[PDB]
Amino acid sequence: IITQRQSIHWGEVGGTYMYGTTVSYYPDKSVRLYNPLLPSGEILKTWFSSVNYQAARTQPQLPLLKRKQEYQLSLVFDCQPENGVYTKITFFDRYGDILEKKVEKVKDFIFTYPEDSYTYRVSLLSAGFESLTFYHFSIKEIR
Amino acid sequence: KLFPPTIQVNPNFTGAISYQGLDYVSLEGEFGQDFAQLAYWAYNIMVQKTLPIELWLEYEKEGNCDFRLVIRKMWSGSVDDFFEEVIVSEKDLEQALFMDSRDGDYFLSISVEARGRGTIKLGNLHQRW
Amino acid sequence: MYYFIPAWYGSERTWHADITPWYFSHFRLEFDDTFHQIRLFQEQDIDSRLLVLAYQPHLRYFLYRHGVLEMDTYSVFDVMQDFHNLHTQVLSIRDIEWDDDCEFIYSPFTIIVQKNGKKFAKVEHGVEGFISDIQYFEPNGQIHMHHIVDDRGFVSSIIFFEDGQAAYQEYLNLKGEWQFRERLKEGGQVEVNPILGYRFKMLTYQNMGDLVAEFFENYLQTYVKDQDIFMLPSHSHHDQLVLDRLPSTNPKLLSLFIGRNPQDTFRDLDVTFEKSDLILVDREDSLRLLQELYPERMHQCYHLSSFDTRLRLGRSQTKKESIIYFQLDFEQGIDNQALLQVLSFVAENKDTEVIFGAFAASQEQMNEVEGIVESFIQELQFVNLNDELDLIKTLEFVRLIVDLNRHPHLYTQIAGISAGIPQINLVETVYVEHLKNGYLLADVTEFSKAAHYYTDRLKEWNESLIYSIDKIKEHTGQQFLGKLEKWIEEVKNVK
Fold first, then answer.
1. Is the separation of the CB atoms in C422 and C460 below 8 Å?
2. Torsion of the alpha carbons at B116, B121, B127 and B128, rounded to the nearest 10
3. Residues after which chain A has a gap (C–N > 2.5 Å)
4. What residues make up the domain containing A4?
5. N or C end of chain B: which has fewer CB within 10 A?
6. Could you give the CA distance from residue C99 to residue C147 in angstroms, rounded to a whole number?
7. Least CA distance to A12: which residue of chain C?
């Protein structure tokens, strides 16, 4: 018996930046972060599109994407300085080399899945947020 | 050691889940009348062939509740079979837990069962010679 | 419009993909001529579609692994199960609604769920980490039902067990309602759920193949035009099912590949050839044997070599080391004379490393060979690969491939000619041409002679690279799209 999700959540805490960080979970699968001693430019969380169970011990959180296809990414969170966090998305080829890093400082943007890609990662980065409630994000095809 | 963010929480637990740094994960609420799995370590500890291990659990607890560990031992290459299950009590945890070397390398997978009501702060799971 | 009908079928049950977990110790040759062809047509922007006839719940990662997910894909079973409006998600274990007394145990290999202290479910994972299937158990330990999860995050079918034996399989729709039920006892018919009998032409089928056939015909009727081209890899289990239903006008290209159609079967293909229009072969030695057996037909038979263009070319020149990939084979035996010859060389020339590699060997077999080699050193590294992808990563900076076994490994050879790495064998192969892209030893002692040939200078190595690039380009380019429309041109004069 499986429950249907339109959106991608934080998932498990493993691999969240935890130096000085409390992370609280709620029944709606949202997550609350707090870290006063936190400078900018650190990777809070990363979501992966392919993982090995033995190392990850979760399932991947990102969907398979089609090479050369355009996608709409939508983040949904409440941050106290509205720019307390931003996003970067990184594309890796079959051999693990970076093809491309996008940085976006807004909650809705459009990206193209690069033609040589094989895996990719979405990261949230810090910019001295006081309060962050993270709800979810999503990645949808564009006609 | 195994940091508290390797601990995953059982989905039936209805209470408060909070991870504080790499110090502890705090579970606060109703744990049930009898011992029932609250949390578990998602990663395994390996005990190698000539290298005996002893384990320490940093923790602290509050309220009318109790917890225990269930340690399960798996040969290298076992997928689903355990050869031992060891209930560890809170008093057992006042001392290090001895895991002896064996003829093959084996792995541990460790549950936290709890009953009662309160706040359990599971901390670092230490491993030494 | 080209239509590819691949030969991606199961081992035990033909119409059912293999459900194996990620840690399962078995090397599978997934690459075939069809994958090379699909990738080729894609690079050239040729209008093509993919008809998957077999039950492929994990189709999408399969295609993604092989770099062909962007294909326009039709799955007959998807239609049978009434998957028109899908919701996709990456299934996480917390998406499943577990009963409230479940207890979780994580092993190095899988997730184990218990109730009342007894094993209750096992959650298994695919190569890229998605949830593959979930087995549910009785308190006595026997399997109860096996849920097969589509990689788009929903339960697709359930195998039901009786006393621990697989009894029947109910294939579900998106709402979990069973569409048809297959009996798994040989002679087993498939029964249609009568509350939706309108969806099928009849309510009982002798075997799954009859059902696949019915919906295959439906596909041809709504989508297919005349002089559409069909790319058919030959396989006993779909050659007649397809070729008996393709209208005569559609040119039909039958494709032969060494990993699928052993040469000793060419004698039996005449009835299939008569219903095909062209015959494509991956090797010239196979091409010759066809022109002997069927000379009335050598205007139909062309050679198109297949390459695995997933691999990078010429990246070894960027390293100072000469990394040597030595191919171990335990069921052919570890030739410790060849190990000794290899170890000698690497000690003697200090600008070189060796990688000893086995496919799907056990730790007992691996420890055996590290003991054998290390004890040789007293009187370098070891890798245990499980899939094509693993060898692909391993060969990235490899300068030289060494396979001194009696039957050189078919994928290692295809990787070598696909990456432009030269190969040293002890036997003749259709893939290595002596001193042009490899070295055929008269015997094992001549090894140091041959190794020096390709690790001394970049001169002779760099010609092997241009040999390989040149051969790839006469079979992957529009150098092939040119050849191809010439051939089907001929077919349309032949009618």
1. no
2. -100
3. none
4. 1-143
5. C
6. 16
7. C94
